[PDB]
Amino acid sequence: SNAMIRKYRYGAPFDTEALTEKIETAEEAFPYGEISQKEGFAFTYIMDEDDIVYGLGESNRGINKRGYCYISNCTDDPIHTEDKRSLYGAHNFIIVSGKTTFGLFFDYPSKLTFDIGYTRMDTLKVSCENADLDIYVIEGENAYDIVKQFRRVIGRSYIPPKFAFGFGQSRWGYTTKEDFRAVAKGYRENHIPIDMIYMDIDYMQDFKDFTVNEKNFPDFPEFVKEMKDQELRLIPIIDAGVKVEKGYEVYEEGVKNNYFCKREDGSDFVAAVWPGDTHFPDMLNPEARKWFGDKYRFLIDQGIEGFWNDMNEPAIFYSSEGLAEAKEFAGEFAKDTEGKIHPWAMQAKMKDIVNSPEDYKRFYHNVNGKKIRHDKVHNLFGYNMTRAAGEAFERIDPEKRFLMFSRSSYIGMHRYGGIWMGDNKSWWSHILLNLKMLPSLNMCGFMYTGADLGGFGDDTTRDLLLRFLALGVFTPLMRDHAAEGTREQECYQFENIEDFRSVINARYRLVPYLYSEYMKAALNDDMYFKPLGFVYPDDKMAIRVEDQLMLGNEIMIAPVYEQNARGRYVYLPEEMKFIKFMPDGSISEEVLEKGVHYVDVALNEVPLFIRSGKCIPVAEAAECVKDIDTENMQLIGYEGSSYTLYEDDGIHKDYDKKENYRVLTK
Ligand SMILES: OCC(CO)N[C@H]1C[C@](O)(CO)[C@@H](O)[C@H](O)[C@H]1O
Ligand SMILES: [Cl-]
Ligand SMILES: [Cl-]
Ligand SMILES: [K+]
């Protein structure tokens, strides 16, 4: 059993349940590099100059992780600049790829530092404060083999309903039925395809989880049906924090049944978020999880078929303790007459109370009769919130797939939902960041993923949105979302709307292919997106390409991510057909040989490349997933080639039937 995977145990690790496969503890010396336990735990390895380091899922910078430091420590940080070491996810799987190749999964739920050539270029050092963890060593002939081994042992990836492969629109600010009707009309009257409209926090009654604003939605299920009859599915947000409010049932039940995270003394810990004071459900306690997940029935029973889980690092604006400290400091600053307390110090204290490391030491989880301080298991919170929801969906309607994705995650959560890449910005560099995160997420089990198209924060432009959308065409989550106070970012908010229709039409024409590749990959523990080096391992040029990706076994993508550009450079490791979805609805085709090329790609054109000896099916454009005609689709690509199409009803879980597969031959 499990010949290629060994598990090395130190101390008394918390069981994260990341793996579904039970691996016995190995008793031999750790097989690579050196282990030191003098400062807790450290693994140190000297890399060959040509080694590439893959992995880390949702983390900053590039596909090859060499040259920086990455700290797994789930953090609400809306400014994703190159210096940042921690974002929302903790995906502790890396692969050293070169003359000596192996994979490592560090199953540890707290702050874990990956110094990948930051300190010394030749040195990989992975460290944490406590030697209480399991480290899995995965052997294999190459990096792709090692990834496939890992994907097997962590269990099958979450599978969304097919409607989730349409286009979605959200904004922090949609509040009233008028707001949502205006979005529906803006897309539908302009014949821009769309399947989902996201409901952000203003839909709740005073930011209370599992409520709907009674003034704005007096007959909510009727409104849900108004939208669904037009093939628009409302996708509401749920937050980690439950508002403290007398008479609010979720709060009352959480208090009475000890379902919230508690302070040292047993009191329910207060964290301020959108509602002001909240309590956090104890996501690591199985009974609290069951209770919290069961609450989703409130929305499911009203016609809702999907959710997004947010603020689940968990994010904390301040604690009662931190607020009191900040106010005391402010009082001193206010009455200072000697000029001893400077404004910068006041500013620093205000910043310090937000997402404070000290607050994460102030509350506990109750697991199997043991109270564990939250910081010790910090990176498991979002994972378990989404597990709570996923497991509830199985109880509520076991036959049905729900759309589900989370901001914060840890390996293991990939069984229950996808992720979105959080609060990016309307920056050109964030198109590239979106692209690079994709294969790494796939290595860690997270295939239903994507970024806020157009950029969440700051102000977008028409061309940036168009280029973001052209990458989103290929990402399973394709959602335009934006922050409050930003320039309006719906496609209909710009001149020459036909260009937006053209780009989103390309998504819908590709949905049968993209869904098929997703399903084949998920059902077989394989990757939807792959780095070029996984497909062309013997090509020294290919292995270092980071701004192109392979999708499935048929195509390569290469989005434009430079402002004012009319094209871009590409490297083709084999002959391919360069394909563009054109704004008049036609599909242009050009054979390009192996090697370096500059390709022209206008703002309203969507490019891809079809590999030698392959073809893909392309449907006529439709405006919602339900209406896509998949009978006798056009086949684009090479004569003599075939394609195996996976197609099911997109709704249920009947995955293993021969009727789901059809061979198309060009
Ligand atoms: O992290 C907090 C904020 C940014 O201030 N962003 C989060 C909350 C939010 O702003 C309102 O619900 C939402 O729109 C974002 O998608 C989410 O990441
Ligand atoms: Cl209503
Ligand atoms: Cl041909
Ligand atoms: K924006």
8 Å CB contact between 424 and 433: yes
Contacts of 475 (CB under 8 A, 6+ apart): 434, 438, 449, 450, 451
Report the distance separating Cα 55 and Cα 63, nearest Å.
7
DSSP SS3 for 463: helix
CA atoms within 13 A on the CB side of 300: 19
CB atoms within 10 A of CB 255: 14
**484: burial class by Cβ within 10 Å (0-12, 13-18, 19+)?**
exposed
- Beta-bridge partner residues of 576: 592, 611
* Distance in Å, CA 80 to ligand 4 centroid: 14
Residues with a beta carbon under 5 angstroms from ion ligand 4: 426, 455, 460, 482, 486
Report the distance separating Cα 95 and Cα 165, nearest Å.
30
8 Å CB contact between 471 and 559: yes
* Ligand 1, atom 6: closest residue by C-alpha: 423
CA distances in angstroms from 355 to 86, 314, 315, 451, listed in the order given:
13, 8, 6, 23
Dihedrals phi, psi of 62, to nearest 5 degrees: -105, -175
Q: Among all chains, which residue has been given the structure tokens 């909240």?
A: 278
Q: At what angle do helices 249-256 and 286-294 cross, to 10 degrees?
A: 160
8 Å CB contact between 52 and 102: no
Residue 269's nearest CA partner among 279, 258, 284, 277 is 279
> Hey, what amino acid is at 355?
N
In this structure, are strands 549-551 and 233-239 parallel, antiparallel, or unpaired? unpaired
8 Å CB contact between 442 and 530: yes
Report the distance separating Cα 436 and Cα 58, nearest Å.
9
Which CATH number fits the domain 1-156, given the four candidates 2.60.40.1760, 3.40.50.300, 3.50.50.60, 1.10.730.10? 2.60.40.1760
Ligand index nearest the alpha carbon of residue 458: 4
- Beta-bridge partner residues of 397: none
In this structure, are strands 418-420 and 449-450 parallel, antiparallel, or unpaired? parallel
8 Å CB contact between 25 and 31: no
Ligand index nearest the alpha carbon of residue 80: 1
Most ligand 1 atoms within 8 A of CB, residue of 209, 311, 489 to mutate: 311
Instruction: Supply the DSSP string of 11-74, one letter for each residue.
Output: S--------SS--PBP-SPPSSSEEE-TTSEEEEEEPPTT-EEEE-SS-SS-SS-TTEEEEE--
Report the distance separating Cα 241 and Cα 260, nearest Å.
10
- Tokens read off for 629: 């005609």
* Distance in Å, CA 173 to ligand 4 centroid: 13
Report the distance separating Cα 482 and Cα 468, nearest Å.
13
* Distance in Å, CA 488 to ligand 4 centroid: 8
Instruction: Supply the DSSP string of 332-360, one letter for each residue.
Output: HHHH--SS-S-HHHHHHHHHHTTT-TTGG
Helix H or strand E segment including 144: helix 143-153
Q: Among all chains, which residue has been given the structure tokens 């083709």?
A: 572
Report the distance separating Cα 276 and Cα 75, nearest Å.
20
Report the distance separating Cα 456 and Cα 33, nearest Å.
41
Q: Among all chains, which residue has been given the structure tokens 């964290």?
A: 271
Contacts of 659 (CB under 8 A, 6+ apart): none
Which CATH number fits the domain 540-666, given the four candidates 3.90.1150.10, 2.60.40.4040, 3.90.1170.50, 3.40.630.10? 2.60.40.4040
Report the distance separating Cα 64 and Cα 80, nearest Å.
18
Point out the ligand 1 atom lying closest to the alpha carbon of residue 422. Answer: 18
- Please tell me the experimental approach by which this structure was elucidated: X-ray
Report the distance separating Cα 127 and Cα 36, nearest Å.
9
Every domain range in the chain assigned CATH 3.20.20.80 = 157-539
According to the 3-state scheme, what is the secondary structure of 69-98? EEEECCCCCCCCCCCCCCCCEECCEEEEEC
DSSP SS3 for 7: strand
Report the distance separating Cα 318 and Cα 327, nearest Å.
12
Every domain range in the chain assigned CATH 2.60.40.4040 = 540-666
* Distance in Å, CA 637 to ligand 3 centroid: 6
Dihedrals phi, psi of 309, to nearest 5 degrees: -100, 130
Q: Among all chains, which residue has been given the structure tokens 């797994």?
A: 72
Residue 362's nearest CA partner among 396, 406, 422, 319 is 319
Most ligand 1 atoms within 8 A of CB, residue of 74, 307, 310 to mutate: 310
* Distance in Å, CA 455 to ligand 4 centroid: 5
CA atoms within 13 A on the CB side of 39: 9
Report the distance separating Cα 495 and Cα 462, nearest Å.
8
Contacts of 637 (CB under 8 A, 6+ apart): 554, 577, 610, 614, 615, 616, 643, 666
Angle at 417 between CA 477 and CA 16, to 5 degrees: 140
- Tokens read off for 188: 């539908």
In angstroms, how far is CA 411 from the centroid of its own chain?
12
Query: Ligand 1: residues within 6 Å at CB?
Result: 76, 78, 172, 200-201, 237, 310, 315, 407, 422-423, 483
DSSP SS3 for 257: coil
Give the long-range contacts of residues 97-100, CB within 8 A, separation 24 or more: 97/51, 97/52, 97/53, 97/54, 97/142, 97/143, 97/533, 98/47, 98/48, 98/50, 98/51, 98/52, 99/48, 99/50, 99/51, 100/32, 100/48, 100/51
8 Å CB contact between 300 and 307: no
- Tokens read off for 420: 């979105």
Point out the ligand 1 atom lying closest to the alpha carbon of residue 76. Answer: 1
Instruction: Supply the DSSP string of 205-239, one letter for each residue.
Output: STT-TT---TTT-TTHHHHHHHHHTTT-EEEEEEE
Report the distance separating Cα 364 and Cα 375, nearest Å.
8
Report the distance separating Cα 473 and Cα 465, nearest Å.
12
* Distance in Å, CA 232 to ligand 4 centroid: 23
For CA atoms 623, 625, 627, 633, give the dihedral sign: positive
Alpha helix segments (H runs only) across 479-585: 498-523, 532-535
Resolution in A: 1.5
Ligand index nearest the alpha carbon of residue 221: 2
8 Å CB contact between 502 and 583: yes
Report the distance separating Cα 560 and Cα 222, nearest Å.
42
Ligand index nearest the alpha carbon of residue 484: 1
Point out the ligand 1 atom lying closest to the alpha carbon of residue 457. Answer: 4
DSSP SS3 for 366: strand
* Ligand 1, atom 13: closest residue by C-alpha: 172
Cis peptide before 314 (omega within 30 of 0): yes
* Distance in Å, CA 176 to ligand 2 centroid: 9
Contacts of 562 (CB under 8 A, 6+ apart): 428, 568
- Tokens read off for 385: 């919130």
Report the distance separating Cα 401 and Cα 446, nearest Å.
17
Task: Write the DSSP symbol of residue 431.
Answer: H
CB atoms within 10 A of CB 246: 6
Report the distance separating Cα 624 and Cα 194, nearest Å.
6
Residue 105's nearest CA partner among 153, 66, 73, 69 is 153
In this structure, are strands 403-406 and 306-310 parallel, antiparallel, or unpaired? parallel
CB atoms within 10 A of CB 360: 22
DSSP SS3 for 485: coil
* Distance in Å, CA 596 to ligand 3 centroid: 21
Report the distance separating Cα 490 and Cα 186, nearest Å.
8
Domain boundaries 157-539, corresponding CATH code: 3.20.20.80
